[PDB]
A paper describes a structure:
The protein was found to be monomeric and the structure consists of two domains, domains 1 and 2, comprising residues 24–184 and 185–268, respectively. The fold of these domains could not be predicted even using state-of-the-art prediction methods, and similarity searches revealed only a very distant homology to known structures, namely to Mog1p/PsbP-like and OmpA-like proteins for the N- and C-terminal domains, respectively. Since PA1624 is only present in an important human pathogen, its unique structure and periplasmic location render it a potential drug target.
The protein was heterologously expressed in E. coli without its periplasmatic localization signal (Δ18PA1624). The data collected from the native crystal were not further used for refinement and structure analysis as the diffraction data obtained from the SeMet crystals were of higher quality. The asymmetric unit of the orthorhombic crystal form studied here contained two chains of Δ18PA1624, which superpose with a Cα r.m.s.d. of 0.5 Å, which is only slightly higher than the coordinate error. PISA analysis indicates that the protein is monomeric, which is in line with observations made during the course of purification by size-exclusion chromatography. Except for a handful of flexible residues at the N-terminus, both chains could be traced with confidence. The Δ18PA1624 monomer has approximate dimensions of 54 × 45 × 48 Å. The two domains interact through a relatively small hydrophobic interface covering about 600 Å2. The larger domain is dominated by a six-stranded antiparallel β-sheet that is covered by one α-helix on the face that also harbors the N-terminus and by a mixed α/β structure on the other. Towards this, it is interesting to note that the interior of the C-terminal domain of the protein is not optimally packed, leaving a cavity lined by hydrophobic residues unoccupied. Therefore, we suggest that PA1624 has a novel, yet-to-be-named architectural domain arrangement.
Numbering used by the authors: 24 to 268
């Protein structure tokens, strides 16, 4: 039928599967997916039930799955969605599990080394919406991209990415926004950013957003060197981070 209001246009891409459901359950992994003893295992997950819109695109032969995935990733982060998990190739675990057990679409099954997966939480006013993107290039040399929105029927918990996800995405995408942080820097989100900046001590960032000054100093007081953090100008409600190469 129609695209998700938040995604880009993949030039000449065709919708090959469209699904909607007013109350479907999704269990989106927050880490690699595998089977142990035949039972499904996720290294962290988010379960939510709500209105599901799932779009399956087949890309034109001229354009790679990885290109469309990067465009989708760039667009969701520029919409200031908080990233929750991002992974490429074998880091995602099994394509068969993602295709079948998570998205329930066997067309998405391909070589593990050709996949990519992203999960984000949309910014308020859509803060109980999750958007998931999955890309694959298959042996038939065709390229597909799955994009799904789950509007949860109940408010989502406090959902945070790992420090590894934050660092990796800051370098793969160059920037990202954390749009579900408290206005006063503290708690889980301050802890996450502190642990992210101790995992790579050389990386430098520019902070912007309505309370970016407050964040930088909370971080200085948790031990981050002030030389590592510059300040930008944005009115976005969240904390925006920009990789200073």
């Amino acid at each position: 039928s129609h695209d998700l209001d938040i995604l880009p246009r993949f030039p000449r891409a065709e919708i090959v599967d469209f699904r909607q459901a007013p109350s479907e359950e999704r269990i989106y992994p927050l880490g690699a997916i595998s089977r142990i003893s035949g039972r499904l295992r996720m290294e962290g997950e988010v379960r939510a039930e709500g209105e599901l819109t799932a779009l399956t695109y087949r890309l034109p032969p001229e354009h790679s799955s990885q290109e469309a995935f990067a465009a989708a990733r760039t667009a969701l982060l520029k919409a200031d969605a908080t990233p929750l998990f991002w992974c490429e190739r074998r880091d995602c675990g099994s394509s068969s599990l993602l295709a079948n057990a998570v998205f329930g679409n066997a067309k998405l099954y391909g070589p593990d080394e050709q996949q990519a997966y992203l999960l984000v939480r949309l910014a308020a006013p859509q803060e109980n919406s999750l958007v998931a993107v999955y890309s694959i290039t298959r042996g038939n040399r065709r390229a597909y991209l799955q994009a799904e929105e789950l509007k949860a029927d109940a408010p989502l918990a406090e959902l945070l990415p790992s420090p590894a996800t934050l660092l990796r995405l800051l370098k793969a995408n160059g920037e990202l926004t954390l749009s579900h942080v408290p206005a006063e820097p503290a708690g889980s989100w301050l802890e996450l950013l502190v642990r992210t900046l101790r995992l790579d001590t050389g990386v430098r960032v520019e902070l912007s957003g309505k309370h970016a000054q407050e964040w930088r100093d909370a971080l200085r007081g948790q031990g981050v060197l002030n030389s590592r953090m510059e300040l930008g100008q944005s009115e976005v409600e969240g904390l925006h981070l920009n990789w200073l190469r």
